[PDB]
A = this chain, B = another copy of it.
Amino acid sequence: GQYKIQIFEKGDFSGQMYETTEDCPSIMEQFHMREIHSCKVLEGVWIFYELPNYRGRQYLLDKKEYRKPIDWGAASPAVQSFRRIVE
């Protein structure tokens, strides 16, 4: 399909993994996770937000894989919501 991403609880794609194809207003409520330590964008372009409901700091994810938060330009693994860039 057009949108798909895998997010991991630990860096270097380790720990538990969750896969999704839709926007997520709160990763704590949906995935019971406080942070994202690494991920892989398999399809589409996405954006990470610091706070719930797409508020706070924004990070564009337009590459393929990210082993650590620094790879998507963040000084911390803090992420609470994310969504697809629809086009």
- Please report A residues at the B interface, Cβ cutoff 8 Å: 44-45, 47, 57-60, 62, 73, 85-87
Contact = CB atoms under 8 A, between A and B. Distances in A.
Going nearest first, the 4 A-B pairs with the smallest beta carbon separation are A87-B87, A58-B58, A45-B87, A85-B85
A85 B60 contact: yes
A58 B72 CA distance: 11
A85 B58 contact: no
Contacts of A58: 57-60, 73
17 contacts: A44-B87, A45-B85, A45-B87, A47-B60, A57-B57, A57-B58, A58-B58, A58-B59, A58-B60, A58-B73, A60-B60, A60-B85, A62-B85, A62-B86, A85-B85, A85-B87, A87-B87
